[PDB]
């Protein structure tokens, strides 16, 4: 059974270069499987980058001269590995990069047509986020008041932050929104809850915010 | 060098079942294969079966298959022989017999048919009769038959059961010059023997002759004065 | 992830079953991947494990796709997570060896308190509960005690070691006394 | 390169429905070198069908592929809970392989108007020199919504951002946040702040507002 | 040779199981016990023992080579390579009529009269990483070993010392060069597995193989000994290899039983150690006669006609 | 199914002399043949086994010979203690179905001694019982062959009576018969004379010893 295991998330400065890795568990030898790399920018569709097929590598027009793709057979300690190097990173390189594998053993299969192919196994993906921002813990602000109330978790880097309410005891009616990227290049998100207006002076509501990359943890009481 | 001990003699009734024990001691139990050999009175040895102890497997005699079983308790070091559906002919002295087999606890096994070590023997009487002490009857010394030297007289232990019976004369003194015959099975289902002692007539009337018959089974000890009547 | 509880000095049987009823390859190892004992088709192979002279299976059950792992004279330390690599399956089973041993002689005056000590493996937190001949359901996680040992408690006690849906009895004899009448 | 234009961009369906998603290639593809993938939010795509109509091993047979002229279509029969998400078509006829823009398949539901709420900047934020005004639209269907910001009656452009939750697994509604950001300086200058929302469930555009300092 | 690339898996080779089952039936009409005991359970724990008593004819069971020819609709494929893991894609495969003559020798610990390794000593393993999977060693140079019902076997101390070396060297050449290699006797288990058991003249020999597997990657053992003498013992009550259960054979009788076999291979089984310092301990193994068969069919695979 | 026949049903011989016993077997029993010795009232005694090998601790005068279906336990200078019945055991077939010979009594042959008949009438006490028992002893004699007849009123009636010889003795080495005619009470009283005719080999001529009721 094929599991493709990619290297972890990276945060990279513009102009820098990065190498992402792919360990192909279940793959015998890249002599029998082609590797195709593909990327997906946020809220975007998918775009082909390049390939290594029969030990021969190559890259699409949009990426030629800027990308090196390699592959090596290994055993024991490690399965076979492919990697993708990208030079001169810019903001429009920020995306999820997927490594992908397709067996080439059977000429008649129909997964492949002279080097151009469908992709039968996918890795989890690796996020490469390209940014000059430095790590920074959030400020947390109350959103005070069926009523609604919440928390604004502002100006942090990088992702993610996690939010629970009342140490996890309040989960019904809670909406925690996807983070947005502001013009400042820092993230912000909010978390809200709807509650009956009656309990507002009787019940206590606190949002528990956790930003692990900055080792920041705050507990904010939200009062009318 | 083992010593085999057996269970007591048992008096079983027809159609029943009997189990005789056989304690094996003095050596390594599992290194022996035990065999039961029965012998009916007057009759001769009949192979009942043999248990390859260690293996806990036992093969039996054709005419017994089904009604006999041989088992061994390695824990207590005992061998057992069970016959079910007892008939009268099954009445016999059941012997326990064993032979060394070799480092059987090590895989070595000679699987010997002969029997080097025998039990004391256990008697089993399978009959419809009931346990009953005997009755001694004096045998008038041939006073009008034999004279000049000595005359023979004795006792007649009649109608006793099950077996066996011991006999001694004069409290146990005159045990010499006595011919105690083997008991005999009467049609009734009971046995009856006889004891006699040819002694000088000139001693009739001073040495009150008394055969001492005992029958532990019925727990009946009997003494009878054999007056020169 | 099965779990079995055992009493110190007793014999426990960690099971392990094969899908079908067929004597196949199996092997008993402990967390440290130390081989306890497997089988070589029809033969039993005992490995380097310290449980060697006390480990053992049931040849007879192998044909019923059954390959236990009986451990005798069980020791507190024998407590562990014994895997069972069989036909590419890892039936990791747990083994907890508890040991209840009263302190002062079974013979104890009237009134004095009775102290019970439960020897248990590390990372193990069982909850004991003995039951006097009368009914004292007194509780004690690791170490129990009978504040005032009443004369109606002098008899057989029925404890219990709770650890993950399982429990192990530990009948103990207690004797109360007097000044005399 | 071959362009694949996918149709429609979104469709709403129910469990048990039959659904059709289509893709027009900018050139003919004689060999039928086309593939379909599914992607669920947060996860890697999965290949479902290749060569136009062939099912990959392990893919339910309620999925099928079809072709006519330059059009290729995926059909989903007996629509199932795990099927919801985004679907992509891909040509691998000619180098380089290319993907359609994608189709989102979401759960059909009755219309539900948003509950609308507006939050002024907190005193703590104002103290730290910034001001964020937040408008919340809670539990509405369908997803299409417009919110406009007005301050001192002036339409606000370029200083706001929106965020939308995934469709809720239990009531199949959406929730949305809109955040208006401005300096502490301008916030303190003007009087009335308003969130104006337009939605199918609303017989008329609803305005929630406040006056600074109430 | 056949101009094609195919997969092979001696560890999942079906001929092994086809021969094994044959060798067993080659035993049910040549060596019949006086009694054979075998487990019999309904599943309800309680297990009666099924006993069987048949004639116990003393026959001098002398194994005849066995060929395996594909019938029709079937073809045997042989792999060719001086060092074949026997588990993967073979390049120099080639179709053959019958497999070489194989003498179905049933034994444990040592593989007798098998087939030597052409090049050098090779060691296959379904997974060397798994301290549970038998390591099948294949000698490129056999070591004569002579056993006698008199109670022992003689082996060349020289040849055996070398062999352990040219084996100990092939081991670390798989588990890590910078790793010490040691050889210890059986860990425990049945007599048939703990000693070098095998059958000669229909007699089940049980040779203690301690002197053959107590080699430390440091010292020797040739003080006042030219040849290694394994104290062997013939048993009558044995654990069956064909199936769980004991079996009793009748005592020896022929004025003399003798064997002179080629130690063409071994069956080792290193102990886990739980990733401890480089000190792999390998001990005798086997007992699963299939590994045997395997060591002979490792490079074969019968296949259906096309 | 193997039959082991010991031809010499009885062998009379004297001490010091050489006694020979022959065990005949059905099919061949190879060498799995043992010999036993049994004293009246004792467990057998393993003499020889495997046909020609004496058991640990056994007099070298006992020779085990034979192989196949013809075995022989020949004894050199027979001994006083060597008196007993001898048994051969076959234990060669397998499955186990061992069989024993029928026996052979190694009795001491001595001088033809005549029997001294003692006729004992039924004690009145015994007659008061309900039956009558006439005992006709036959003291010390040899060849156990001693035909006895019960003649009631010179009536050769032969029925209600039962013999019982004794074993060979120690000193004398003779036998003692014991015939017992057990009649009723009403029939014992119905007859006058009760004679007992002993016809022994060592008796010059028939010897009738009787008595009349009284
Ligand atoms: C990026 O690569 C270009 C050519 O693709 C080269 O001219 C330039 O020096 C590189 N930039 C950096 C920062 O290395
Ligand atoms: C013994 O095994 C038999 C199987 O033949 C089974 O039916 C029976 O219940 C078991 N119990 C006995 C008879 O010992
Ligand atoms: C050859 O041996 C290596 C060493 O363990 C093993 O990984 C591989 O599966 C074997 N077969 C192949 C693929 O060459
Ligand atoms: C293999 O055998 C040759 C001789 O046949 C020997 O010289 C060589 O060293 C062996 N390879 C090893 C060390 O395993
Ligand atoms: C190889 O053996 C290791 C343990 O030694 C095991 O974890 C691994 O799964 C085995 N290889 C496979 C995938 O069969
Ligand atoms: C084994 O016996 C053979 C004869 O078959 C002999 O040549 C050889 O020297 C013997 N090997 C020993 C005893 O080392
Ligand atoms: C062995 O490990 C490496 C080889 O992989 C070697 O460089 C190192 O010096 C050695 N260390 C040990 C384990 O002695
Ligand atoms: C022979 O083997 C036994 C166990 O099978 C072992 O304990 C003994 O020490 C060995 N003797 C020799 C030859 O070293
Ligand atoms: C292995 O080493 C131990 C201790 O170092 C020693 O007692 C043993 O004899 C050695 N094995 C042999 C005989 O080579
Ligand atoms: C060790 O003994 C062997 C014979 O057992 C002999 O051939 C060898 O020369 C000895 N070792 C040396 C070189 O002393
Ligand atoms: C096989 O074993 C015999 C027995 O010792 C030996 O003499 C012969 O040379 C060996 N032949 C082989 C396979 O080299
Ligand atoms: C082959 O090995 C067997 C082991 O079972 C042995 O008995 C036989 O003698 C060997 N071949 C020869 C030389 O006869
Ligand atoms: C390896 O030897 C022992 C293994 O028991 C271990 O304690 C030690 O730390 C390791 N290294 C040394 C000291 O050789
Ligand atoms: C054999 O050689 C031919 C050369 O035309 C080639 O096509 C074929 O693949 C080769 N087979 C092997 C050994 O791989
Ligand atoms: C198998 O074919 C290869 C390719 O030419 C060759 O190198 C090798 O020697 C051949 N093996 C044999 C001897 O069959």
Q: Are A81 and A28 found together in one domain?
A: yes
Q: Are B168 and B124 found together in one domain?
A: no
- Pocket-forming residues, ligand 1, beta carbon under 6 Å: A 15, 65-66, 87-88
Q: Are B25 and B119 found together in one domain?
A: yes
Instruction: Output the six-digit token pair for B126.
Output: 């399978």
How long a stretch of residues is chain B?
229
The nearest CA of chain C is from the CA of E35 a distance in Å of 17
Q: What residues does each domain of chain E span?
A: 1-306
Contact E112, E264 (CB under 8 A): yes
H helical segments located in chain C: 59-62
User: Residue C178 CB: number of other CB atoms within 10 A?
Assistant: 9
Q: At what angle do helices E14-25 and E289-297 cross, to 10 degrees?
A: 120
Distance from the alpha carbon of residue E128 to the mean position of ligand 5, in angstroms? 9
Contact E229, E238 (CB under 8 A): no
Q: Are A122 and A165 found together in one domain?
A: no
What is the phi/psi pair of residue C109, to 5°?
-45, 180
Which residues 43-72 of E have a C-beta within 8 angstroms of F? 53-56
Look at residues B128, B149, B183 and tell me which one is the last residue of a structural domain.
Answer: B128
Q: Which of D75, D142, D78, D143 is nearest to D110 (CA)?
A: D142
E and C touch with 3+ CB pairs <8 Å, answer yes
Q: How far apart are CA F172 and CA F31, in angstroms?
A: 39
Contact A193, A205 (CB under 8 A): yes
Nearest residue in D to A126, CA atom: D44
| Domains of chain D and any CATH numbers | 1-108 (2.60.40.10), 109-212 (2.60.40.10)
Where along chain C do the CATH 2.60.40.10 domains lie? Answer: 1-98, 99-173
Q: How far apart are CA B160 and CA D91, in angstroms?
A: 113
Look at residues B112, B128, B144 and tell me which one is the last residue of a structural domain.
Answer: B128
Q: Which CATH superfamily is domain E1-306 in?
A: Human immunodeficiency virus 1, Gp160, envelope glycoprotein (2.170.40.20)
Instruction: Output the six-digit token pair for F2.
Output: 């193997």
- Of all protein residues, the one whose alpha carbon is nearest to atom 3 of ligand 8 is E208
What is the phi/psi pair of residue C115, to 5°?
-105, 125
Q: Are B73 and B8 found together in one domain?
A: yes
Q: Are B28 and B123 found together in one domain?
A: yes
Subunits with at least 3 CB pairs below 8 A relative to chain F? B, E
Q: Are B115 and B139 found together in one domain?
A: no
DSSP 3-state of B82: strand
Give how far Cα A127 sits from Cα of A9, A19, A122, Å.
Answer: 5, 12, 14
Q: Are A44 and A111 found together in one domain?
A: yes
Q: Are A45 and A100 found together in one domain?
A: yes
Q: Output the DSSP codes for D67-129.
A: EETTEEEEEE-S--GGG-EEEEEEE-SSSSPEE---EEEEE----BPPEEEEEPPPHHHHHTT
Nearest residue in A to D161, CA atom: A180
Q: Output the DSSP codes for F137-159.
A: EEEEESSS-EEEEEEETTB----
Nearest residue in E to F93, CA atom: E55
Q: Are A11 and A117 found together in one domain?
A: yes
The nearest CA of chain C is from the CA of E190 a distance in Å of 6
User: Which residue in the block uniquely carries the two structure tokens 């018969």?
Assistant: F177
Q: How far apart are CA B139 and CA B198, in angstroms?
A: 12
Q: Are B123 and B142 found together in one domain?
A: no
User: Any idea what the CATH number is for the domain that residue A35 is in?
Assistant: 2.60.40.10
Look at residues A79, A104, A132 and tell me which one is the last residue of a structural domain.
Answer: A132
Q: Are B99 and B144 found together in one domain?
A: no
Q: Are B36 and B140 found together in one domain?
A: no
Angle at F17 between CA F12 and CA F23, to 5 degrees: 55
Domain covering C1-98 in this structure, CATH number: 2.60.40.10
Q: Which domain holds residue B213?
A: 129-228
Q: Which CATH superfamily is domain C99-173 in?
A: Immunoglobulins (2.60.40.10)
User: Residue A1 CB: number of other CB atoms within 10 A?
Assistant: 5
Give how far Cα E152 sits from Cα of D59, E161, E259, Å.
Answer: 64, 19, 10
Q: Which domain holds residue A37?
A: 1-132
- Of all protein residues, the one whose alpha carbon is nearest to atom 13 of ligand 1 is A15
Residue A8 per-residue DSSP state: P
Q: Are B148 and B218 found together in one domain?
A: yes
User: Any idea what the CATH number is for the domain that residue B211 is in?
Assistant: 2.60.40.10
Number of compact structural domains in chain A: 2
What is the phi/psi pair of residue A17, to 5°?
-125, 155
Q: Are A170 and A212 found together in one domain?
A: yes
Q: Are A182 and A107 found together in one domain?
A: no
Residue C175 per-residue DSSP state: B
Task: Looking at the CA of residue E216, tell me the nearest atom of ligand 9.
Answer: 1
Q: How far apart are CA E260 and CA E144, in angstroms?
A: 7
Look at residues A109, A132, A155 and tell me which one is the last residue of a structural domain.
Answer: A132
Subunits with at least 3 CB pairs below 8 A relative to chain C? E
User: This structure's resolution (angstroms)?
Assistant: 17.0
Distance from the alpha carbon of residue E120 to the mean position of ligand 4, in angstroms? 5
Task: Looking at the CA of residue E227, tell me the nearest atom of ligand 10.
Answer: 5
Distance from the alpha carbon of residue E85 to the mean position of ligand 3, in angstroms? 6
Look at residues A98, A132, A166 and tell me which one is the last residue of a structural domain.
Answer: A132
Q: Which ligand is nearest to the CA of E277?
A: 13
- Looking at the DSSP bridge assignments, the partners of residue E48 are E40
Residue E179 touches chain B, beta carbons under 8 Å: no
Contact A136, A179 (CB under 8 A): no
Residue A141 touches chain D, beta carbons under 8 Å: yes
Give how far Cα F27 sits from Cα of A149, F88, F90, Å.
Answer: 108, 15, 11
Contact D139, D42 (CB under 8 A): no
């Amino acid at each position: 059974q094929i599991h493709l295991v990619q290297s972890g998330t990276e945060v990279k400065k513009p102009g820098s270069s990065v190498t992402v890795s792919c360990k192909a568990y279940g793959v015998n030898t890249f002599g029998l499987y082609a590797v195709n790399w593909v990327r997906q920018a946020p809220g975007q569709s998918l775009e082909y980058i390049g390939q290594i097929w029969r030990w021969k590598s190559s890259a699409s027009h949009h990426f030629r001269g800027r990308v090196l793709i390699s592959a090596v057979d290994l055993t024991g300690s490690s399965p076979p590995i492919s990697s993708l190097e990208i030079k001169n990173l810019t903001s429009d390189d920020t995306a999820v990069y997927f490594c992908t594998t397709t067996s080439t053993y059977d000429k008649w299969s129909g997964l492949h047509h002279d080097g151009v192919m469908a992709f039968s196994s996918w890795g989890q993906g690796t996020l490469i986020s390209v940014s000059a921002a430095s790590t920074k813990g959030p400020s947390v602000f109350p959103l005070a008041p069926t009523a609604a109330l919440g928390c604004l978790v502002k100006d942090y880097f990088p992702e993610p932050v996690t939010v629970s309410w009342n140490s996890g005891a309040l989960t019904s009616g809670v909406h925690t929104f996807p983070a947005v990227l502001q013009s400042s290049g820092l993230y912000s998100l909010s978390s809200v809850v709807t509650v009956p207006s009656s309990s507002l002076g009787t019940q206590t509501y606190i949002c528990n915010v956790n930003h692990k990359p900055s080792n920041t943890k705050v507990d904010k009481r939200v009062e009318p | 060098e083992v010593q085999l001990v057996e269970s007591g003699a048992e008096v079983k009734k027809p159609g029943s079942s009997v189990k005789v024990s056989c304690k094996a001691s003095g050596d390594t139990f599992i290194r022996y294969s035990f065999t039961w050999v029965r012998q009916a009175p007057g009759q001769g040895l009949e192979w009942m079966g043999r248990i390859i102890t260690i293996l806990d497997v036992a093969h039996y005699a054709p005419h017994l298959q089904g009604r006999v079983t041989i088992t061994a308790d390695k824990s207590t070091s005992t061998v057992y022989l069970e016959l079910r559906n007892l008939r009268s002919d099954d009445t016999a002295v059941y012997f326990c017999a064993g032979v060394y087999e070799g480092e059987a606890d090590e895989g070595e096994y000679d699987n010997n048919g002969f029997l080097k070590h025998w039990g004391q023997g256990t008697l089993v009487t399978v009959s419809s009769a009931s346990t009953k002490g005997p009755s001694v009857f004096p045998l008038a010394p041939s006073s009008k038959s034999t004279s000049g030297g000595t005359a023979a007289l004795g006792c007649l232990v009649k109608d006793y059961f099950p077996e066996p019976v011991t006999v001694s004369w004069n409290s146990g003194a005159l045990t010499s010059g006595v011919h105690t015959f083997p008991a005999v099975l009467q049609s009734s289902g009971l046995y009856s023997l006889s004891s006699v002692v040819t002694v000088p007539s000139s001693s009739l009337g001073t040495q009150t002759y008394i055969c001492n018959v005992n029958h532990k089974p019925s727990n009946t000890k009997v003494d009878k004065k054999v007056e020169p009547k | 992830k099965k779990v079995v509880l055992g009493k110190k000095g007793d014999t426990v049987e960690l099971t392990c079953t094969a899908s079908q009823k067929k004597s196949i390859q199996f092997h008993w190892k402990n967390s440290n991947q130390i081989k306890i004992l497997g089988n070589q088709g029809s033969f039993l192979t005992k490995g380097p494990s310290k449980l060697n002279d006390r480990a053992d299976s049931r040849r007879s059950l192998w044909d019923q796709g059954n390959f236990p792992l009986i451990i005798k004279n069980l020791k507190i330390e024998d407590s562990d997570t014994y895997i069972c690599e069989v036909e590419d399956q890892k039936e990791e089973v747990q083994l907890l060896v508890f040991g209840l041993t009263a302190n002062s002689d079974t013979h104890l005056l009237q009134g004095q308190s009775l102290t019970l000590t439960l020897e248990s493996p590390p990372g193990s937190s069982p909850s004991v509960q003995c039951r006097s001949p009368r009914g004292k359901n007194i509780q004690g996680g690791k170490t129990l005690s009978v504040s005032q040992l009443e004369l109606q408690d002098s008899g057989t006690w029925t404890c219990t070691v709770l650890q993950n849906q399982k429990k192990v009895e530990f009948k103990i004899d207690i004797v109360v006394l007097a000044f005399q009448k | 390169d071959i362009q694949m234009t996918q149709s429609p961009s979104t469709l709403s369906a129910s469990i048990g429905d039959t659904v059709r998603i289509s893709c027009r290639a900018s050139q003919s593809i004689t060999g039928n070198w086309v593939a379909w993938y599914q992607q669920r939010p947060g996860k890697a795509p999965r290949l479902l069908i290749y060569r136009g109509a062939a099912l990959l091993g392990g893919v339910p047979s309620r999925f099928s592929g079809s072709a006519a002229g330059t059009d290729f279509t995926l059909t989903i029969g007996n629509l199932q809970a795990e099927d919801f998400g985004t679907f992509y078509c891909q040509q691998y006829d000619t180098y380089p392989g290319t993907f359609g823009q994608g189709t989102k398949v979401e759960v059909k539901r009755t219309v539900a108007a948003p509950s609308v709420f507006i939050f002024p900047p907190s005193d703590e934020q104002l103290k730290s020199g910034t001001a964020s005004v937040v408008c919340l639209l809670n539990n509405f269907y369908p997803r299409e919504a417009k919110v406009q910001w007005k301050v001192d009656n002036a339409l606000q452009s370029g200083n706001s951002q929106e965020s939308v939750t995934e469709q809720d697994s239990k009531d199949s509604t959406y929730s949305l946040s809109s955040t208006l950001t401005l300096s502490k300086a301008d916030y303190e200058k003007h009087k009335v702040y308003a969130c104006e929302v337009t939605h199918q469930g609303l017989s008329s555009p609803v305005t929630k507002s406040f006056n600074r300092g109430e | 040779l056949e101009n094609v690339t195919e997969n092979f898996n001696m560890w999942k080779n079906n001929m092994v199981e086809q021969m094994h089952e044959d060798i067993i039936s080659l035993w049910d009409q040549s060596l019949k016990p006086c009694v054979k005991l075998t487990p019999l359970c309904v599943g309800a724990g309680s297990c009666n023992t099924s006993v069987i008593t048949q004639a116990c004819p003393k026959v001098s069971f002398e194994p005849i080579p066995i060929h395996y020819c594909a019938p029709a609709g079937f073809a045997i494929l042989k792999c060719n390579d001086k060092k074949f893991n026997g588990t993967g894609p073979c390049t120099n495969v080639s179709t053959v009529q019958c497999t070489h003559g194989i003498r179905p020798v049933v034994s444990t610990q040592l593989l007798l009269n098998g087939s030597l390794a052409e090049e050098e000593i090779v060691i296959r393993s379904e997974n060397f990483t798994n301290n549970a999977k038998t390591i099948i060693v294949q000698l490129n140079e056999s070591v004569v070993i002579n056993c006698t019902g008199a109670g022992h076997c003689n082996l060349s101390k020289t040849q055996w010392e070398n062999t352990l070396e040219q084996i100990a060297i092939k081991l670390k050449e798989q588990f890590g060069n910078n790793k010490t290699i040691i050889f210890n006797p059986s860990s425990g288990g049945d007599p048939e597995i703990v000693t070098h058991s095998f059958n000669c003249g229909g007699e089940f020999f049980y040779c203690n193989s301690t002197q053959l597997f107590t080699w430390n990657d440091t010292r020797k053992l040739n003080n006042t000994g030219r040849n290694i003498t394994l104290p062997c013992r013939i048993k009558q009550i044995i654990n069956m290899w064909q199936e769980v259960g004991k079996a009793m054979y009748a005592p020896p009788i022929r004025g003399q039983i003798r064997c002179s076999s080629n130690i063409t291979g071994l069956l080792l089984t290193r102990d886990g150690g739980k990733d401890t310092n480089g000190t792999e301990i390998f001990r005798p193994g086997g007992g699963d006669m299939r590994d045997n068969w395997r060591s002979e069919l490792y490079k074969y695979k019968v296949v259906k006609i096309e």
